[PDB]
Design a protein around this ligand. Structure first.
Ligand SMILES: *Cc1c(COP(=O)(O)O)cnc(C)c1O
Ligand SMILES: *Cc1c(COP(=O)(O)O)cnc(C)c1O
Ligand SMILES: *Cc1c(COP(=O)(O)O)cnc(C)c1O
Ligand SMILES: *Cc1c(COP(=O)(O)O)cnc(C)c1O
Ligand SMILES: [Ca+2]
Ligand SMILES: [Ca+2]
Ligand SMILES: [Ca+2]
Ligand SMILES: [Ca+2]
Lengths: 297, 274, 280, 308
């Protein structure tokens, strides 16, 4: 999508989503020797940035009968919420479950199950990342980030976000490069599931043989999407990988220092600073993608 | 202390502490059928409101050799940060030895005055929003916070209810107010709210409570846990068990409390769980 | 009135008034060797702080039939605004009224000699301290214009209740220093006739009976200013901050121009109003 | 220029300019039947938006020897301010015919007044340039100046976005076209359906005439109007092509409407806005019926002299 697509997406979803804050922490800054800007999407409607993509697509549909969604978990809640906003029914096909079911969505291998439903109910299928309107929606988070950083008079040398299917990164990259092409846009992946990094270097989409094995449950995707890959090839500077150990440490830091509840895959950007800090610029914007983790006393 | 003491305290500590935000959540509101205002002290320096009290007292001393504290938990950290700010030593009989100044966690005027600054902020912030709470709820241990809070609130709007909250298995402050005298637990209570396992209210806080507090509510351990869960999952905020007591009270006594409530999230220093 | 009266007043009028900004001007701070905090009451409803006092009194009346007042100018608009909020009729007698009082039975809202009016004006003082605290700035003094004494009395009550060490000072044109003279004599001295000054808002013949004792106990002093300084201060606010402030609202700045050297470095100034005629 | 140029200009000038507020007034919205968003450039450093353009060009210069400018108003102050930031000297040429010279000199700029007049000023400056080697900063016919002015448009959309209000049209005054070209670029790049309209005194509608014509049309002599900041005899060479393709139209307003516009802002909002900075509000007064419901108005400046 283009920059205009992103702005139009912002206009459509603005009244139903939060202008999440760009948090800063002197504690973290001082411990890591960096100037960090934390885009708080864990404070977004439904607990993650996914509400943006789902609403962007749902509100552009002309008189749809209902909404249909694969799974993901976070995307399920996003679609359910959008279903509420439009006042229609939402059917979710999952393999985050209780929450989705809560928003008034009936939850229910994958692909074939959805296909048979899309024809059966006639609802609109909302893909979690391989849809132009969905990508435009996720990207609005990038438009905001720049505006907020601008208001602060702080310009990051790099923007770090997690990558699974690539919807968020593709959207973020489109926003950043259209305004400041010299700003690095970096994706982050668990080292145990680095098909995106390998795909980008080889110029072709490589797929993981089997489900990874990482605590970042939001990016256990087998491969990048067909629509997101070409955008990443053109606008993303690189992809960094992190160990499970560093991811755990990143979560611990957010939890204990900023008192924010961020789910594991939402902590990948911080993990990357922990392991590759010396090779990154001084001022970094981190996309805390979600805060939907289970409670434990 | 008086209202002028609290403001005097605010001035001393303002540069070293955060003007904590007053959070609102449409999820909690719609869920509890209330209008809740959450004073986020878990976002205060060191992770709890204790920083205010420690700083309030530390900055009031003339040439302090060092600072001394009787570890209770969050107070230890508060006193450490204070020493740091002053650029002196913090250690949590060593008094006569090194001559360090002892900072009690709740039974000291300047400490109580410091905790109270949270009450002054709450009111100004609510006032800017144009929202006036019918009641302010805060957890109670030794009574420093509740005493400071009551002082700020009653001095400005005596019709606003100031309610303390404590776990049912450690309801000494409630029964102490009932008997017009201090009662004391014989042994540490069995409760998840490790921040309020105090054996009794302080001697300097008790009188302020009988005079300025409207009552103490008790909560079950089950209600506490649920309050923690709602805060965790719905507001995505890390609040330690003791800081979720106010919300636990709304869960168990909602029907008999005002429609608009100010809750004091006293701290966020809870251990990380993978 | 009491600090609690100011807060109750704040609660009554909050919904119908503006929490006006506490403005800061790097330029001004630069031109003067000071750090100035400008309470923007010129941006309040009706154009002046008066809206505060009018609504405080008016919203506490039990089933008022209508409102009537000794029209001073800005007060007239405040009372008129208050009547619109209540939904009753406002009768203003601008250059008698008591007859209309008996006739209609309307409530008379005095411009300054009324506890509820004073309490109302005083809410600007509660805001000022709250906004300044949020900024982490603590002024060594607060300066405000003095006519009837309502504003200064309310302000003095708010500031002294929280920080008595903070200086509270009134300011009036030298051509009308009756309030100043009164604080010296310990009695209410009156002006032989209109003082004639550009600060039209404070050309009252004497301090009020309910405000005078509050001032004698809560006001640290009153400063007088020449008409030349007033004009200068008025030109400064106009060209440097681009704010339309009426002459009387510029008195506190004029005092800095003439007495700066003997005032603390950080000062809070109350810009009382911005209701001046337009002139291309 | 380009949207990236605008953002680049923003980055360069950000630390030395104000992110001026997007003011809203219940009163104004009441009088007119509109939702008005007022971009307060009168609150910008030096009193007008021109500080943006000036800094944008000046900060981009390498090892400048000094700054030079030929202006009869606000641009002079902008350049002088820019010169203070760089730490170099500023030379301003203005005809020997107000107090606006005092402000320029206030920012530490040297003013060449001697026997200077219109038509003659350009030659005097060219000569001063040749002699000093100082860089000349044009008030509107320079890509970096236009990019700088356009940053106001970037802020405007961000601020509007933050409050969730999307203007159906943006209105700004038109003199040389720098402000309008920069604003049109920012706005059209993000949302093309959003109307961008200029406003000029009807006694100087050369811009409106040029856009309808297809080429630049100049004025015989100095126009007669209160709006002193837009008495430019004609649009600029670099701004005109941008306007022709990125501007939806130009509105003209009576001197009567302008005066009322100024009165309303002065009395209702308590803001000191110079007459030309009031043109956008005047357009609403006279053409409100043909404009959308939600309008963004560019209050270009607040540099009018004090009047007791
Ligand atoms: C969906 C999701 C991601 C991954 O985004 P992709 O568009 O699939 O790259 C990352 N973090 C969280 C919390 C998510 O929900
Ligand atoms: C210390 C503490 C309390 C109780 O305060 P007292 O002044 O001792 O009543 C409550 N919550 C937390 C998180 C604390 O650290
Ligand atoms: C009424 C008024 C004053 C004077 O206040 P008193 O309460 O009468 O002392 C000063 N400035 C303005 C703009 C006023 O309207
Ligand atoms: C210079 C100026 C204008 C006109 O801008 P142009 O870029 O020359 O069209 C409008 N208003 C004010 C206050 C100005 O200074
Ligand atoms: Ca992967
Ligand atoms: Ca107890
Ligand atoms: Ca007098
Ligand atoms: Ca023209």
């Amino acid at each position: 999508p283009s920059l205009q697509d992103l702005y139009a997406a912002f206009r459509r979803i603005a009244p139903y989503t939060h202008r999440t804050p760009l948090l800063t922490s002197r504690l973290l800054d001082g411990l890591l020797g960096k100037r960090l800007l934390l885009k708080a999407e864990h404070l977004q409607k439904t607990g993650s940035f996914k509400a943006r993509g789902a609403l962007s697509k749902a509100l552009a549909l002309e008189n749809p009968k209902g909404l249909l969604a694969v799974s993901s978990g976070n995307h399920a809640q996003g679609v359910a919420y959008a279903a509420q906003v439009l006042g229609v029914k939402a059917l979710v096909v999952m393999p985050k479950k209780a929450c989705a079911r809560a928003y008034g969505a009936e939850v229910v291998n994958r692909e074939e199950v959805a296909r048979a439903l899309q024809e059966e109910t006639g609802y609109a299928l909302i893909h979690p990342f391989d849809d132009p309107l969905v990508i435009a929606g996720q990207g609005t988070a990038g438009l905001e980030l720049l505006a907020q950083a601008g208001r602060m008079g702080v310009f990051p040398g790099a923007v770090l976000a997690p990558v699974g299917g690539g919807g968020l990164l593709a959207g973020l990259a489109t926003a950043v490069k259209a305004l400041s092409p010299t700003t690095l846009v970096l994706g982050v992946e668990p080292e145990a599931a680095d098909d995106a990094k390998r795909s980008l270097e080889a110029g072709r989409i490589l797929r993981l043989e089997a489900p990874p094995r990482t605590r970042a449950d939001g990016v256990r995707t087998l491969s990048l999407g067909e629509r997101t890959f070409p955008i990443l090839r053109e606008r993303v500077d690189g992809i960094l990988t992190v160990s499970e150990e560093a991811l755990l440490e990143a979560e611990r830091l957010l939890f204990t220092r900023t008192k924010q509840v961020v789910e594991p895959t939402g902590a990948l950007p911080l993990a990357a600073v922990l392991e590759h800090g010396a090779r990154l610029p001084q001022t970094l914007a981190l996309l805390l993608s979600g805060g939907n983790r289970d409670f434990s006393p």
